[PDB]
Every structure is written in C-alpha cells, then in structure tokens.
C-alpha cells in the first residue's frame, strides 16, 4: 500500500518518472515527491529485479538510460592516484561527457545492470520512499 501511483516492494514505494533531468536534478526532484524520497537505491538482488520489471513496464518508450541513486559523492573526475610509472596524476584534459561518474540502467542490459554515465545527461528515473 502506497500513495496513488507508487508501487510497493518490501515496505518501500517506487515511482517511475518520465522526466529528463540531470542526476543532480532528478535527485532534488525525488526529495520533494514524498517523505524522505530519493532516487531508487538497489541494495539487493530481488530489489533490482523489481526495479527492472517496473522500469520496463513503465519507462520503455523513448530509448535511454534510467538514473539510479549511486554516485561518487566527490569532485574527482578520476580517483586513481597515479600513473603506471608511479607519478601523481596532476594534469588533466578530460572531455566532460567522458568522466562517467553517475550510474544508470538501460534496456540494452534489460535494466538489470549498472552503466557508468555522464551526470549532465537528461534521463528518466525511479524514485523511492
């Protein structure tokens, strides 16, 4: 039992949203959707199968990713301390779209796998409360 439009699975409510927002923005959007809401957190196998059935049965209408709550809560575009020769990586020239630091889900992988994606993307998502 959950609000109208939310689905239940193990005492939690889930809502697939078909809005194209950046990670940072879909996250902020979920907090203001329910009491203590956030982007879905897949913390178990069963939970992941459920989010996949949900995402498939609801979002699958315009080819793209579906955000999930996992993110390097930091500002490091990479986190590997050194180069193979043992030097400090202190010079950079990353393409932004190329530092895939937020995670997503996708139809290509039957919405059961985490794909490293660019945080500035605009994709739908699943919130959880």
């Amino acid at each position: 039992d959950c609000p109208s439009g939310w689905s239940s699975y193990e005492g939690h409510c889930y809502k697939p949203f078909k809005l194209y927002k950046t990670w940072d923005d879909a996250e902020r959007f979920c907090t203001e959707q329910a009491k203590g809401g956030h982007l879905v957190s897949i913390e178990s196998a069963g939970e992941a199968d459920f989010v996949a059935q949900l995402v498939t049965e609801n979002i699958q209408n315009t080819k793209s990713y579906v955000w999930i709550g996992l993110r390097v809560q930091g500002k490091e575009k990479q986190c590997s301390s050194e180069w193979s020769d043992g030097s400090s990586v202190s010079y950079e020239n990353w393409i932004e779209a190329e530092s895939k630091t937020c995670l997503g889900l996708e139809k290509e992988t039957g919405f059961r796998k985490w794909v490293n994606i660019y945080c500035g993307q605009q994709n739908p998502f699943v919130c959880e409360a």
Partner: protein, 123 residues
C-alpha cells in the same frame, strides 16, 4: 638519446605501437620494451601534444591506451539515501583512460578491452 625506434621529447622516449592489447597486457608489454618502460603518462599539455602529433604521423588515426586505469574504482561510492556500497550490479568492472590521434583529449574505455598504445621511459 633514444633507441632508433623511439621519438625523443624533453629527455624522455615515446614510441607508439599497433598491436591492440588490453590495458594490463599493454602495460605489461611496455616494461619489456626498455629498462624503465611503462604506458604513457601525460605530465602536461605540451608532452601530451607531442605524443598526439606522434601517434598521428605514425599510424595516422586510431585509439591509443594511456597510463591510467582503475580510475573511478576507488572513488567514494554511496547511494543518495546515504547508504554505503554493498550490493553491486556494475556492467563493467573497471575503466581505463585512452586517447585518439585526432586530439589531446582523455577518454575512458573499459580496461579489459583493446586499443593501440604509446610506451615511454626516460634517458
């Protein structure tokens, strides 16, 4: 001074190859190419440009590896509900930086894949 097969830049020796190998293997291979060999580490834009003009003139246009791997693997990962990373469902285990002969930009490809590469050592 560098072997006849290497290009010299600021007291270092760079040489690009064309046997697509995984990250680990391509880094393995480099140590066996000369005492102190390793995959290419770009300590600067200048060094990075030199390497780019170099891979270009040689094999003209393809993707080369670089000395960065396990890049985001040791980042602090946690869900937005503040939970720690425990369950996992990653599609790819680790990422490796690589560049392409057209520009001096750092890209990222899964480590266990294949591309060309540039080895280097000093003096």
């Amino acid at each position: 001074d560098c072997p006849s097969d290497w290009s010299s830049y600021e007291g270092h020796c760079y040489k690009p190859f064309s046997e697509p190998k995984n990250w680990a293997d391509a880094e393995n291979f480099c140590t066996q190419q000369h005492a102190g060999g390793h995959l290419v580490s770009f300590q600067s834009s200048e060094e990075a440009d030199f390497v780019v003009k170099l891979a270009f003139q040689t094999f003209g246009h393809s993707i080369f590896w670089m000395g960065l791997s396990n890049v985001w693997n040791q980042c602090n990962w946690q869900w937005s509900n503040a939970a720690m990373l425990r369950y996992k469902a990653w599609a790819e285990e680790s990422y490796c930086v690589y560049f392409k002969s057209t520009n001096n930009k750092w890209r990222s490809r899964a480590c266990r894949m294949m591309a060309q590469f540039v080895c280097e050592f000093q003096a």
